[PDB]
């Protein structure tokens, strides 16, 4: 059973029972979420709808807000006696999937 959803600025493939990582959501851990836009409902027969499939949602539960591992961005110009250094860790949320549209 397949569904494809628009989350963040991207698209993900989805299934009942599996967990997904995603851009930060504005929902506290333990609460429920509804992904409104469904792109395709595969599985046995596919529903290939113009932009979205009419009336299908996907339900989940937020599990955890985290941070990714650290990236360092360092920049210098050879022979020009100058450099600049910066770090960065990225937020995410983890979501469990339950009941692709029915």
């Amino acid at each position: 059973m397949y569904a494809i959803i628009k989350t963040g600025g991207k698209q993900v493939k989805v299934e009942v029972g599996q967990a997904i990582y995603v851009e930060k959501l504005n929902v506290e851990a333990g609460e429920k979420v509804v992904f409104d836009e469904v792109i395709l409902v595969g599985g046995e027969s596919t529903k290939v709808g113009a932009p979205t499939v009419a009336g299908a949602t996907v339900e989940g539960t937020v599990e955890k807000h985290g941070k990714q591992k650290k990236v360092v961005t360092f920049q210098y110009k050879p022979k020009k006696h100058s450099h600049r250094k910066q770090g960065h860790r990225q937020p995410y949320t983890k979501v469990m999937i339950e009941a692709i549209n029915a």
């Binding site: 006696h81 100058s82 450099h83 600049r84």
Partner: protein
């Protein structure tokens, strides 16, 4: 006032500038003097007027 909580008045003391201590401070490597010439030497310069 207790001797373990001193505080000068705001704007009254400033720190200091130390030249020749690395590139990122702004004044390493020639310490504000530009490239070569009479004004880049120790004791360089012309008399007043």
């Amino acid at each position: 006032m207790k001797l373990h909580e001193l505080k000068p008045a705001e704007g009254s003391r400033q720190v200091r500038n130390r030249v020749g201590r690395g590139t990122s401070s702004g004044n390493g490597k020639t310490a504000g003097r530009g490239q070569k010439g009479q004004k880049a030497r120790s004791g360089g310069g012309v008399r007043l007027g």
